[PDB]
Symmetry: C4
Subunit: 254 residues, 4 copies
């Protein structure tokens, strides 16, 4: 049932945000030690768990970009597209609120101790606990290219890993492998844009952060062109390119 | 036989404590380098091994909260509940004593060198080698919420990973995946409460620490409200919520 | 079709370079924290993904040394050898350009801040983002021995992991295991030569770096004997020794 | 054939030493960054590869303690025991020489720079590249207890992971899981004795180090009672206890 699938997409997208935003909060306001690979693998494995938990019900999209791509290249029912996307964004938003609720005291004490005014340009760093912001050395277009390229890779390898006509079928290994994939994408490109590669994963938490006191910078990142647009559209375009590329360069040869 | 199952629960719960408490002792009194993810994955993988070693005999609960939940939602024989719980707590207690026995000299030399009086408020840090204590910035209720939420997630994903009616059956991958799950829970929430999520894993070692010289603070954590109550009840409530939620939101849709 | 296989070899070799060179760029010009094991496992897992993505089409060589060895000991069609090698080198070259394009600004800002003249001997460090260079304490012959030994091990274990007549068949685990293998080779020997073990992985990116401003040192490493020859021939010789050794010492006993 | 099996045991034991001693050399004389978990997982995964490479031929003992235990509790042919042990020790010795050969220059330059006299008490640290030595805070008996306990755990879980009558058969996952097991044992207890848990893994390299200039301290560790005896006998006793315990406490209940 569609209602059941939306609930699963809501929970699954929320789960991956819980683990992902959770470890970044630990890093930023709890003083926990994590390198780039550690934060990346925790997020990737968290996604794997979200898939194992929802694959049997909704097919585990947990990403607006994947939903749209599966509709354009995998015959996914277009009538379930928007319900899926709303469920995903809502799930991400709620999980972000939940993580903030559990780490509540650490955020304030950290802001007090380091004299950080929530909502100021300098608070964009802590807002980074919930969503992504560009590296100081790159611009809007540069960041857009990164998100596009990585989501194309994301979609392409997801189809490859779940394509039973490509080499030996992965079976129950698929979700795990998809998580490991997300881990290497995050570790190799994360310093540039935080590798959002998922509109719901970024927008939902940004809306929460906006409501929780970070204000307008939660959306703009303090840049001339509102940054939120990159994590919102870059992945959608990328996922489409990736799906197309797989069927044309790899599928058409299997 | 019940006697055989209790022995398995005793050994399995003891195994996961050996590895878990072992690496924390290495971190605290042996100067070994470990980040938050490293200590968490070692504990998670250790749990996986404990499951592979006991699944075929007792079903590998190794956690009072899981035993109680499987009794309320999985038709587990209520006559085996208490025997299982006593075996689990006893196993955790003995493994803690074993780890202390092997690291014995390092504890004393560390306390001597850093002028730490065992049993004082400041010794709660080393007592943390055996069990969990709250982050300095959060209170009793806050810590209770964390343990509840994470154990609900723990139970929910355990049912999902072992549910052959949900997506492609995991088979022998299940225990490993459950260990990886524990790893991401510990890495994303560990800075808050040490992610006990298991009454036997926390209480047994606390009793040992109490007997080994840490005294009353082993139980209270040096807080107004004795902390041990959180790791004791928070997980039980959480496991129940998690089991219920899985069958209602995911099971009823498979 | 050969055309389809060349495309797959081009994409697969390009993928492993994207992830590999990507994380090193993060380390060198983005200030990301990675230990030796982290950079090594990211590269190994990246290779695994490249295999899952191309195994069903070309058999996933993604390495000139492996192609040549499979031709000499696995009956691989010699008519596909050169097309495969050209595809591999081209793929590696393009992925290197792509990574440089995404990290563009960080390279220049880093060179400006640290007063590094691209093309000078001291820029060999940053050129190391794309390919391999010898440890300061070893010479040409010493580096040649390392690459030979590790590629022999690489080839030998690849045959062992994909040999269904050796123990229980790995099935879909094979690519993952091959990635983990590459990870341990890189972590245990990487400080010596960067463990190239693949002519295309090293030469293609070196040509790009040469074109991108690093000049002649990209090829020589600033050494009397042009270093590029080691990563070029050491692996080919090694792969052959490894293949031979497997069939004679392990295969002939199965 | 026995000759073929001895060759496999020689290569497999040599492989695990190559990776293991290799990464420690990187840590000690090449300045590579590795935490306790990283060095431990590299060694564990290296063992897994050694098993995948030799399981089909010899059954992959790669450890004198395991060979002796399988003879006493698994009906292993006693006529193959000594040939297996000699092959294992020889393999470990040769791999140690090989790693020293590749890192040759770094050892000398490090000793020159830090003014270390090879063979002196203070050189025991570098000798630790090849084999194990006790933590400064524990004595002979204490170290003996550690090796005994961990090898008992090692043997017990190896039987459990390879016992098709215990839960769902692991199949091709077994070797990997055994490697992960070795990883958690090394990470949780490594700071105490270096977790040798294998007579060949320790003695062979100690003999090499003795011959390579470290002299008598390679065997004694600079202690009153020659340390080499612990890694030599502690594991044998432990493996026997572990095998017995598994069949009595877990097997007899399956
Ligand atoms: C799941 C529903 C979550 C609703 C949003 C709750 C946000 C609570 O967040 C609060 O927001 C206030 C207003 O910005 C700030 O002043 C407070 O500092 C902040 O704690
Ligand atoms: C599915 C997602 C739809 C998003 C629609 C655009 C929402 C943009 O959100 C807007 O961002 C501005 C940034 O300057 C703020 O000033 C506004 O307050 C905010 O509403
Ligand atoms: C497995 C059974 C374990 C029984 C408990 C052994 C505890 C030994 O621990 C000892 O306890 C003493 C009293 O608190 C302290 O004074 C010592 O410092 C401590 O080493
Ligand atoms: C299954 C677990 C049952 C636990 C029952 C409660 C045991 C509490 O333990 C008590 O904690 C107090 C904390 O101030 C101490 O003062 C007491 O000495 C100690 O016995
Ligand atoms: C995929 C095709 C890539 C072609 C090579 C593009 C290299 C762009 O690189 C440019 O090269 C110039 C000349 O060396 C340098 O002066 C510039 O600093 C550098 O950015
Ligand atoms: C398949 C790979 C074929 C490589 C053929 C050799 C290419 C060597 O390349 C050469 O290296 C020299 C190093 O000093 C440079 O001076 C030259 O400019 C460069 O063309
Ligand atoms: C595989 C066969 C290996 C045989 C042992 C080779 C040891 C080479 O090692 C050498 O040993 C000399 C004598 O101790 C030392 O003086 C040298 O410094 C050392 O490099
Ligand atoms: C299978 C392994 C058999 C080992 C037999 C004992 C070998 C001990 O080796 C001995 O150790 C002494 C330590 O002080 C040294 O003085 C001797 O030179 C050395 O031969
Ligand atoms: Mg690490
Ligand atoms: Mg790791």
């Amino acid at each position: 049932t569609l209602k059941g699938q939306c609930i699963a997409e809501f929970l699954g997208t929320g789960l991956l945000i819980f683990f992902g935003v959770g470890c970044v909060a630990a890093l930023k306001v709890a003083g926990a030690s994590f390198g780039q690979w550690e934060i990346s693998v925790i997020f990737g494995l968290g996604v794997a768990m979200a898939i194992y938990l929802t694959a049997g019900v909704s097919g585990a999209h947990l990403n607006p970009a994947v939903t749209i791509a599966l509709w354009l290249f995998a015959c996914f029912d277009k009538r379930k597209v928007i319900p899926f996307i709303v469920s995903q964004v809502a799930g991400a938003f709620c999980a972000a609120a939940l993580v903030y609720g559990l780490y509540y005291n650490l955020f304030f004490d950290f802001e007090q101790t380091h004299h950080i005014v929530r909502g100021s340009v300098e608070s964009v760093d802590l807002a980074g606990t919930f969503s992504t912001y560009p590296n100081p050395h790159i611009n809007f277009v540069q960041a857009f290219a990164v998100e596009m390229v990585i989501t194309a890779i994301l979609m392409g390898l997801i189809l490859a890993l779940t394509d039973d006509g490509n080499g030996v079928p992965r079976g129950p290994l698929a979700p795990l492998l998809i998580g490991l994939l997300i881990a290497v994408i995050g570790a190799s490109m994360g310093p540039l844009t935080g590798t959002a590669m998922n509109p719901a994963r970024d927008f939902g938490p940004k809306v929460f952060a906006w409501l929780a006191g970070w204000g307008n910078v939660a959306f703009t990142g303090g840049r001339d062109i509102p940054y939120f647009l990159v994590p919102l559209f870059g992945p959608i375009v990328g996922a489409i390119v990736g799906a197309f590329a797989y069927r044309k360069l790899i599928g058409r040869h299997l």
